[PDB]
C-alpha cells in the first residue's frame, strides 16, 4: 500500500517501470476520460533562458507523446529556405563543382520562410513567389602593392578565401520592395566557402527554395530541439561529516549544496535540475543507499537552438501551429465524407 | 480535399463500423503517436493502435475498435479535436509566458 504518482525511480542495474499511470482505467478512481479543464489547470510553461538562438522553457504537465511530437516538428517539419540549384558559369577552384554545390546548400539564409511558398513540381524557373537568387563571383589576384613577404593575406590575396560576405542577393522580381536592403542575406558572413590562388575564379548563381528538414537536413531550422525529464534527488538520510563532500562530488557540482547548519557539515539538494545523469553515486558502495535519484513524471525541460533563420520562440510557435495544421487537415479531410 | 494524401478507411471483416483501420498518408510517428495518445483517453474505445507499414513508405495505419454502439469514426474525429484543443492551449500559454519573461527581463 504505497503510491508513487510523480517520479520515474531508478537504480543502477536498470530503471524500474516505463509507465505514468495517468490514463483511462489506470487506477481504482484515478480513471481518465481526458478532462480538458484538468489539463488547462495543471499545465504551465516556464522559460529558463532566452538569448538569441536559445530557449529553455519547462513545459510542465504534458505527456511524453505530445512533447515528442513538438520535438520532432522542430527538427523535421518547420519550413526553411535553402539553396537547391547551383548554376556554375566557370569554376577554376580546387573545390569541385558538386562539392561546391553541396557546401552551398548547407549555408543558412536569413529569409523568413513564411513569406514564400513551395515551388510546384517541375517549376524549374521559379518566380518572386517561391525563389530567392544569390550570386558569388570572386577572382583571386596578387596584390601589386606587396613586398617580399609570405603572409597569404598580404600577398597572393585580393580574394584568397571566399566567404559568405561575397554572396550578393539578385532581387528576382518586386522582392526589392517587401524586402528592405539588408533583410535577405546569408545568416553568417564568415563561413569559409573555398580558397583560391592567383588566377583562380568562382562564378555561380544559387537558387533557394522552401522545404522542411524532413526531405533534407539543409532545410532544418534548429541545431537541436531535444528535451529531458526533470531529475529528482532525495536524501533519505542526513549526510554529514565529510561524507557530505564525497556526496557533493558524485553529482554535477551545483546539485548538492553542502551547508554548515552546526559545527558539523550537512549536504542539502540545492538545485536538482543541474544534474546530469552520471550515476556516480552508485560507485560509492556506502552512499548508494542514502540517495534516491529518479525523474519527475511529466515535468520536461526543452532546449531549442536555431541556426539563425528565425528566433527560437517563433520556432516553437510555428511547431505548435504545424501540429495544429496536421490535426486540422485530417479533421477537414474526414469532414469531406 | 486530397483524395489520398489523407484518409483511406478499411472497415474490417464484415465491414464492422466498430472496427476501422484508417490509413493516414504523409504521416510519421509524430501524429500517429500523439493521436493514439489522445484517442486512448476515450472510455468508449476498446483498442487503439497505430503502426507504420514500411520504412520506405510514408503512411501510418491506425486501428480503432470501439464498444458496441459508436461507429469508431467519432473516436477518431474526437481525438483529433482534443489534440488540436491541447495544441491551441499550449500555444496560448507558451506565448503568454514568453511575453511575460520578455517584459520581466526588459524592465530590469
Amino acid at each position: 500500500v504505497e503510491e508513487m504518482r510523480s517520479r520515474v525511480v531508478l537504480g543502477e542495474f536498470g530503471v524500474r517501470n516505463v509507465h505514468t499511470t495517468d490514463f483511462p482505467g489506470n487506477y481504482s478512481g484515478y480513471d481518465d476520460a481526458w478532462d480538458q479543464d484538468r489539463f488547462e489547470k495543471n499545465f504551465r510553461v516556464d522559460v529558463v533562458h532566452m538569448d538569441e538562438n536559445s530557449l529553455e522553457f519547462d513545459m510542465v504537465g504534458i505527456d511524453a507523446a505530445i512533447a515528442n511530437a513538438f520535438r520532432r516538428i522542430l527538427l523535421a517539419e518547420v519550413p526553411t529556405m535553402a539553396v537547391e540549384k547551383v548554376l556554375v558559369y566557370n569554376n577554376t577552384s580546387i573545390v569541385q563543382d558538386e562539392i561546391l554545390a553541396h557546401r552551398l546548400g548547407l549555408i543558412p539564409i536569413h529569409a523568413d520562410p513564411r513569406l514564400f511558398e513551395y515551388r510546384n513540381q517541375g517549376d524549374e524557373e521559379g518566380t518572386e513567389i517561391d525563389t530567392l537568387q544569390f550570386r558569388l563571383q570572386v577572382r583571386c589576384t596578387r596584390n601589386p602593392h606587396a613586398a617580399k613577404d609570405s603572409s597569404d593575406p598580404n600577398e597572393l590575396y585580393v580574394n584568397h578565401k571566399v566567404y559568405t560576405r561575397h554572396m550578393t542577393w539578385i532581387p528576382l522580381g518586386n522582392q526589392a520592395d517587401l524586402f528592405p536592403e539588408g533583410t535577405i542575406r546569408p545568416v553568417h558572413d564568415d563561413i569559409l566557402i573555398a580558397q583560391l590562388r592567383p588566377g583562380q575564379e568562382i562564378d555561380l548563381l544559387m537558387h533557394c527554395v522552401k522545404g522542411i528538414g524532413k526531405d533534407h537536413a539543409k532545410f532544418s531550422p534548429v541545431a537541436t530541439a531535444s528535451y529531458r525529464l526533470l531529475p529528482d534527488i532525495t536524501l533519505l538520510e542526513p549526510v554529514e561529516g565529510e561524507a557530505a563532500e564525497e556526496l557533493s562530488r558524485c553529482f554535477s557540482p551545483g546539485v548538492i549544496e553542502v551547508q554548515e547548519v552546526q559545527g558539523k557539515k550537512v549536504a542539502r539538494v540545492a538545485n536538482p535540475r543541474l544534474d546530469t545523469f552520471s550515476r556516480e553515486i552508485f560507485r560509492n558502495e556506502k552512499l548508494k543507499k542514502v540517495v534516491r535519484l529518479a525523474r519527475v513524471r511529466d515535468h520536461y525541460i526543452f532546449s531549442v537552438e536555431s541556426t539563425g533563420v528565425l528566433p527560437p520562440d517563433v520556432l516553437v510557435s510555428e511547431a505548435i501551429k504545424v501540429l495544429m495544421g496536421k490535426c486540422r487537415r485530417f479533421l477537414d479531410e474526414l469532414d469531406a465524407v | 480535399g486530397e483524395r489520398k494524401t489523407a484518409l483511406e478507411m478499411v472497415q474490417a471483416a464484415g465491414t464492422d463500423r466498430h472496427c476501422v483501420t484508417f490509413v493516414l498518408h504523409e504521416e510519421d510517428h509524430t501524429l500517429g503517436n500523439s493521436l493514439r495518445y489522445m484517442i486512448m483517453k476515450n472510455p468508449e474505445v476498446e483498442f487503439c493502435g497505430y503502426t507504420t507499414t514500411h520504412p520506405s513508405e510514408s503512411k501510418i495505419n491506425l486501428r480503432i475498435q470501439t464498444r458496441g454502439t459508436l461507429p469508431a469514426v467519432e473516436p477518431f474525429q474526437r481525438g483529433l479535436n482534443e489534440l488540436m484543443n491541447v495544441c491551441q492551449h499550449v500555444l496560448d500559454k507558451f506565448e503568454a509566458s514568453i511575453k511575460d519573461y520578455k517584459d520581466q527581463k526588459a524592465s530590469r
Binding site: V47, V48, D58, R273 | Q104, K105
Partner: peptide, 5 residues
Amino acid sequence: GNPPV
C-alpha cells in the same frame, strides 16, 4: 539552470 527569477 533556474526558470526566470
